[PDB]
Amino acid sequence: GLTCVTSKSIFGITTEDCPDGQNLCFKRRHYVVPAIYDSTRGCAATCPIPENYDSIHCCKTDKCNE
Questions:
Q1: DSSP code of residue 2
Q2: 1, 38, 41, 58: which could form a disulfide with 30 (CB 3.0–4.6 Å)?
């Protein structure tokens, strides 16, 4: 199925063959402190709605959420 990054960091890269009915990848950008942003990634059925002043990018190709 669609492949997405479910984790990316100084400890490496996790990639998942997405559960059926999840044909979207997402990458959330979250401000923790002034110059520091936590990124979160995964597969989803629908694009998650951003909160906390976050921004979220959603896309539909393999590992598009790098």
A1: -
A2: 38
User: Over the Cα atoms of the chain, what is R_g?
Assistant: 12
Structure tokens at 39: 């990124």
What resolution in angstrom units was achieved for this structure?
Answer: 2.0
Q: In angstroms, rounded to a whole number, what is the distance separating the alpha carbons of residues 64 and 12?
A: 17
For residue 24, give its domain range: 1-66
Q: Which two tokens stand for residue 38?
A: 């936590």
Q: Residue 12 has which token pair?
A: 């490496």
| Experimental approach | X-ray
How many domains does the structure of the chain reveal? 1
Strands 55-59, 36-44: pairing kind: unpaired
